[PDB]
Amino acid sequence: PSRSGILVFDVNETLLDLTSLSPLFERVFGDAKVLREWFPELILYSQTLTLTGLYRPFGEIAAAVFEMVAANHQAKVTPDDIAELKTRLTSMPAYPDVAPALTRLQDAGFRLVTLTNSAPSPAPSPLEKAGIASFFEAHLTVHSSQRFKPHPSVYDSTAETLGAKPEELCMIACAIWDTIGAQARGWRGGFVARPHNTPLTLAEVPQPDFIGRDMGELADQLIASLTA
Template sequence: MRDDNPASIVVFDVNETLLDITTLEPLFARVFGDGAVMREWFAQLILYSQTMTLSGLYTPFGALGVGTLQMIGTTRGVTIADGDVDELKERMAAMPAHADAVPALSRLRDAGFRLVTLTNSASGASPTPLERAGLGEFFERSFSVEAVRKFKPAPETYRLVAENMDVETSDLCLVACHLWDTIGAQAAGCRGALITRPHNAILPAAEVPTPDLAASDLTILAEQIVQRWQVSR
């Protein structure tokens, strides 16, 4: 069954949703003796990015990522060397695409959807991480929160996409593997589609928006989007 007002533009989160952040784990295994520390680092990075926005402050995501690595080094009594910082930057710039990304993006593009990205990461020179991962060709535009100097899930970040694409937020469907991202998108008037990659799930609590769609695989989620909101060609 399709909604009366279909979501014609699919907006993809990038880090972890499309690009595989587990390729950062060897750095954390070497530095801290445990690759699982990468999850602590990423969670703290998201926490402090959102803290900066709530406080009316802004520091680029990459700089926060480096600072978070150094902060965890301090709390764990581990010295973070310049080479460790360089390796983090190099690995973040070279994260590969998840195996389900290309089939899902191909399905949505072939069904007539317009595809864009919205990331907390700052924009950069070509080749971008998406281009290095072989995904750049699928997207009409790539948006960074740096334009509004606020991190997701601030409503201004989703409105940025709607305004630049000259549509209403209700025309957008945000695809992400982080529930905090789909919650923010839905609160801003967008649709939300959750890909439940490992370490991400729905939060069953009162007043927490449930994603419009959810699946454990991006190709399945893409098919759900097509079946619900396929646009006329």
């Protein structure tokens, strides 16, 4: 029974702050801005392996891509750097606005779930460390699909697992590519702006059903919609 609806949250960038990796980019590359290059490269190659029928765990593509991007700049990279990337990736802090919005949405009767590209860790997971894991009834990953978002099977198997119908699900992300993936499967999409994350707009591509400049505004819209 979905209640107000099921809200399926993306984790990296959406809940957890990617700029917390900056220091490592500042040091190794002499420019923190390289973060904004390495990340799309990472997403790109995860969707590449997905399209060609290959799978390696996200953190591993992340390390290979960090190496790749390093070579591209002629920047030196030690096995120490790669381990720190793993450390920082799995320890990203939650945006301050997340816990109050999760509280409000729970109280408004929403079911709350996470769906990430990141492979299962041993405990503690990044959200556990961040102190926000317990807001959610389930924490799912692409590892069981052996394919990255936005492949349809990631969303479909998630809806299966939750015994939910697409009309009852809402994918929440700051990445329009993830909302696009979910909407194409019949889910609703909810966009939350994060610094350096604005929506893409393109003909024939459904827009998000809900948009907020931050998680609190998005929760205003999701809650408003229950009675609107």
